[PDB]
Design a binder for this molecule. Structure first.
Ligand SMILES: [Ca+2]
Ligand SMILES: [Ca+2]
Ligand SMILES: [Ca+2]
Ligand SMILES: [Ca+2]
Ligand SMILES: [Ca+2]
Ligand SMILES: [Ca+2]
Ligand SMILES: [Ca+2]
Ligand SMILES: [Ca+2]
Lengths: 169, 169
């Protein structure tokens, strides 16, 4: 659990980006100014929701350690949504927005992932929420977010493909 | 250092992704197989260059540690290009592919970063190569990639921005 003196400076930099007056805390106003500069236009209310999720001491503002938490939570969530999406892309050959049992079977076999056709058929059956025989994005996401589970092995194979697809391409 | 059995399990899965036949080394042929499936269509000299760029023992294939090196490199580059791209998208308010002195001043002020008329001025002069008085994507990247150390501070605030913009949406 070390800590590079640089990595610290970076969190300091992210923090100062929000704390304009530099008193050590992040007020809603401050969060908003930044938020707008990036895109969204959250309401005095929507902003408060962000604070609460990290407000450890519940004093209304965001201190460095709390921001640190928020920072991480989002770094993880953002990184995740990206590799899952990237993976979806790698599977949805035709790009029509679905993943036919063919697309799935082929990719997994072409990567030397070694998965019995049954396991692949099972994978689909389980992810197929609406039962249309294919996997849409929502259903793919769910599958990568959810006992006698060897489905965990499959998820790790897929997370790697996603991560790889990003890192490279 | 701070290494967990989770990271280890991740790199193994990644390496295994490339080592189709599980022999402990990744060949130019396997690199290609994964790369094509990942969407790209690299060429023979392009694969070779990838391997020689990390082939410490120079045996023509890639073993685990060399792969780790490759991974760290690609990961660092990818994260950099994304943060920088996002930062540019944040400054280019009108989204015309250029960043005028106005925009640069707007965003830096809004956030909480210094930059007086002179600072924003030299910054643009330094980065502007074609001399059209502005800063396009190319120049921006080159500038973010590099006399006082003042420049270094501005570059760092810009990275935090790229980083934050990405992490928030
Ligand atoms: Ca403050
Ligand atoms: Ca607090
Ligand atoms: Ca499809
Ligand atoms: Ca379905
Ligand atoms: Ca091999
Ligand atoms: Ca080697
Ligand atoms: Ca512009
Ligand atoms: Ca220019």
């Amino acid at each position: 659990d070390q800590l590079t003196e640089e990595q610290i400076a970076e969190f300091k930099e992210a923090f100062s980006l929000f704390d304009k007056d530099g008193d050590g805390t992040i007020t809603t106003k401050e969060l908003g100014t930044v938020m707008r500069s990036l895109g969204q236009n959250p309401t005095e209310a929507e902003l408060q929701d962000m604070i609460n999720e990290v407000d450890a001491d519940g004093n209304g503002t965001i201190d460095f350690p709390e921001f640190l938490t928020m920072m991480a939570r989002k770094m993880k969530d953002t990184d995740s949504e990206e590799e899952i999406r990237e993976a979806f892309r790698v599977f949805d050959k035709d790009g029509n927005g679905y993943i036919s049992a063919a697309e799935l079977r082929h990719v997994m076999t072409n990567l030397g992932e070694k998965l019995t056709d049954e396991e692949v058929d099972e994978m689909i059956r389980e992810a197929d929420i609406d039962g249309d025989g294919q996997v849409n994005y929502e259903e793919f996401v769910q599958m990568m977010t959810a006992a006698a589970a060897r489905k965990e092995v499959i998820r790790n194979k897929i997370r790697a493909i996603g991560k790889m697809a990003r890192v490279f391409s």
